[PDB]
Amino acid sequence: VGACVLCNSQTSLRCGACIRRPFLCCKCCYDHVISTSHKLVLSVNPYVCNAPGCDVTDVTQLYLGGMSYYCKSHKPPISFPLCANGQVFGLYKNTCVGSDNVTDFNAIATCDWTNAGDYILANTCTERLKLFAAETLKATEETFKLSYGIATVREVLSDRELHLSWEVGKPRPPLNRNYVFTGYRVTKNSKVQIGEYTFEKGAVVYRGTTTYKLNVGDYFVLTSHTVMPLSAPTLVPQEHYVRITGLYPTLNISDEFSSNVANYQKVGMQKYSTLQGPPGTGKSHFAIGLALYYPSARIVYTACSHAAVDALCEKALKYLPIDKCSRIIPAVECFDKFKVNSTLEQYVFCTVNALPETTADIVVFDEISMATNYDLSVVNARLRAKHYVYIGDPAQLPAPRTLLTKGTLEPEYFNSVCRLMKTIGPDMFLGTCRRCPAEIVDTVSALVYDNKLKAHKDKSAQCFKMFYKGVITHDVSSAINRPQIGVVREFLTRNPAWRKAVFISPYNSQNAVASKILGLPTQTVDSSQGSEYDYVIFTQTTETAHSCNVNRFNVAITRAKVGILCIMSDRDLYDKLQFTSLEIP
Numbered sequence: 001v002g003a004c005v006l007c008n009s010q011t012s013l014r015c016g017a018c019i020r021r022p023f024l025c026c027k028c029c030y031d032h033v034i035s036t037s038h039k040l041v042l043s044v045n046p047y048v049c050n051a052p053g054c055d056v057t058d059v060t061q062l063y064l065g066g067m068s069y070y071c072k073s074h075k076p077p078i079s080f081p082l083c084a085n086g087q088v089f090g091l092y093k094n095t096c097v098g099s100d101n102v103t104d105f106n107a108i109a110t111c112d113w114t115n116a117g118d119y120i121l122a123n124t125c126t127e128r129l130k131l132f133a134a135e136t137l138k139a140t141e142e143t144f145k146l147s148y149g150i151a152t153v154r155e156v157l158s159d160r161e162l163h164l165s166w167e168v169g170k171p172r173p174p175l176n177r178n179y180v181f182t183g184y185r186v187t188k189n190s191k192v193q194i195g196e197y198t199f200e201k202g203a204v205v206y207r208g209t210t211t212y213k214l215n216v217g218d219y220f221v222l223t224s225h226t227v228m229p230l231s232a233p234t235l236v237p238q239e240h241y242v243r244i245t246g247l248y249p250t251l252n253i254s255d256e257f258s259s260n261v262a263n264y265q266k267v268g269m270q271k272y273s274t275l276q277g278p279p280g281t282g283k284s285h286f287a288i289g290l291a292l293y294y295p296s297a298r299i300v301y302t303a304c305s306h307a308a309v310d311a312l313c314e315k316a317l318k319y320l321p322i323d324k325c326s327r328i329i330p331a332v333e334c335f336d337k338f339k340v341n342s343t344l345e346q347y348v349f350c351t352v353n354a355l356p357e358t359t360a361d362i363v364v365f366d367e368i369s370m371a372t373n374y375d376l377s378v379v380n381a382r383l384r385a386k387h388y389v390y391i392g393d394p395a396q397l398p399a400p401r402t403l404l405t406k407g408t409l410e411p412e413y414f415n416s417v418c419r420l421m422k423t424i425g426p427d428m429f430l431g432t433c434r435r436c437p438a439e440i441v442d443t444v445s446a447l448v449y450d451n452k453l454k455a456h457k458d459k460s461a462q463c464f465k466m467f468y469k470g471v472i473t474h475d476v477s478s479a480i481n482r483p484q485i486g487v488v489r490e491f492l493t494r495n496p497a498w499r500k501a502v503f504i505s506p507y508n509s510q511n512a513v514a515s516k517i518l519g520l521p522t523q524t525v526d527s528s529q530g531s532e533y534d535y536v537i538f539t540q541t542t543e544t545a546h547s548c549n550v551n552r553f554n555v556a557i558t559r560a561k562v563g564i565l566c567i568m569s570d571r572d573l574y575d576k577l578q579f580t581s582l583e584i585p
């Protein structure tokens with residue numbers, strides 16, 4: 001028994017073809033089964049024919065005869081059909097309201113999540129369907145990981161290098177950081193974990209969580225977890241107040257945080273607030289400063305990634321009493337300078353998926369572009385707070401969508417929070433970039449921030465752009481542009497100071513080739529998000545939707561503190577770069 005995800009109507013029916021098995025009311029369960037291929041219906045029991053060796057599960061072909069269920073062929077003389085009168089049969093038959101359209105729930109229940117349209121709907125549908133879609137997608141995501149073949153260590157060529165043998169008649173996952181494996185040792189009568197791992201083409205390179213002397217017969221699977229059901233909404237109901245509520249501002253504040261005093265008062269004057277923090281505008285400075293402005297306030301700092309939480313811990317270590325901070329870790333190497341797993345500490349730093357059930361004066365949820373509606377609901381379900389602050393930049397990168405192939409996902413569709421920030425705008429905006437030379441601020445201000453991002457620094461005069469298509473080669477799941485690496489190699493012979501540069505590209509294989517030929521440290525745009533370097537060399541590599549995604553480009557070129565060389569493929573973004581042009585040698 002439970003609640004009808006379309007009506008709320010109390011019901012004893014869940015669709016058994018739906019991977020989540022959502023409770024549906026007589027009217028909603030019926031309208032669902034007759035308009036789609038879903039025909040298995042679950043109650044206190046499953047509406048299946050209880051006859052001996054009969055394979056009827058379709059609820060439109062089944063009858064209640066006695067207190068058992070039968071098809072047409074096996075039914076007793078006295079029966080009624082399970083599924084007639086525009087309704088399906090269970091408990092609470094007389095309480096049931098229905099819907100004028102069931103169209104959105106059917107599409108959510110039946111899509112394979114390969115089309116952008118599927119994510120657009122999951123983000124514009126009613127709130128209760130946002131949860132259903134968030135669960136349904138995540139389960140589809142964790143199941144798709146099972147479809148991948150096991151990889152087995154056939155030979156240990158060296159340290160940090162292997163020869164893999166792959167399961168037959170199953171696809172092989174891409175070998176990039178977005179696919180984290182889990183090793184396993186071959187025991188008497190089972191298997192035991194041996195750290196998480198990643199792989200990249202050579203034989204294969206492997207960068208594992210822990211070090212070992214792993215040997216033949218050891219194997220690797222992408223560990224998938226149980227997806228729990230969602231109760232709480234993605235955003236609580238908004239409330240605007242006329243005074244600061246439940247929070248007592250400080251009388252003395254330092255000139256370090258004085259620029260955020262207006263913004264921190266806004267935080268106290270509404271239930272939830274969005275802060276768009278572009279690159280190097282001071283998001284974590286803002287987050288920690290909130291603690292100093294409201295000194296007695298209990299604050300849970302949360303983000304999706306360990307990295308994101310740890311960076312909040314680093315900043316907190318510089319400004320807040322260590323004895324008042326705690327890092328929550330579930331029983332990967334993260335921050336270890338606070339007492340571990342102390343829920344009742346004033347300042348609690350913890351990933352979304354590890355949150356305890358607790359209350360707080362303020363909740364800060366950082367790197368919000370990376371959040372899914374699933375994460376949004378979980379936080380609302382674990383944390384009951386006087387105030388909620390969402391910090392991020394919908395102009396930066398989202399959580400990768402492993403199933404998406406048709407269409408681009410626009411930032412207004414990354415999650416409920418990014419949708420608000422792109423439709424009504426963000427409550428607060430950090431308008432001054434401290435990190436990047438002016439040529440780079442001017443470029444991304446126009447490109448994705450509506451000319452509202454201002455440069456601290458001056459022109460560096462060390463921002464260059466070269467238009468060079470070169471030659472694109474493809475391997476199993478990535479792109480390589482060797483002539484673009486060549487152009488960079490020639491550039492470093494004539495400009496050897498740039499040998500301190502980080503190499504960035506949109507492709508892990510480009511990076512692996514660039515690492516051999518150049519010896520620069522390498523990052524995917526996607527791994528570079530939240531890091532800064534004095535000097536950045538960027539090869540676009542292709543003109544795909546992937547290498548031209550304006551959020552990706554935004555992150556690529558805002559990594560640079562001093563200078564950047566951009567070797568471009570796309571005539572569009574090249575022409576948008578407010579950088580010095582260089583001829584091809």
Ligand SMILES: CC(=O)N1CCC[C@](O)(C(=O)O)C1
Pocket residue numbers: 174176178477478479506507508509524546
């Ligand atoms: C769609 C696409 O081409 N991608 C996103 C996933 C990683 C990637 O395959 C790579 O790093 O090679 C690039």
Ligand SMILES: [Zn+2]
Pocket residue numbers: 015016017018032038109
């Ligand atoms: Zn269904």
Ligand SMILES: [Zn+2]
Pocket residue numbers: 004005006007008009024025026027028029097098
């Ligand atoms: Zn219903």
Ligand SMILES: [Zn+2]
Pocket residue numbers: 049050051054055056070071072073074
């Ligand atoms: Zn039967």
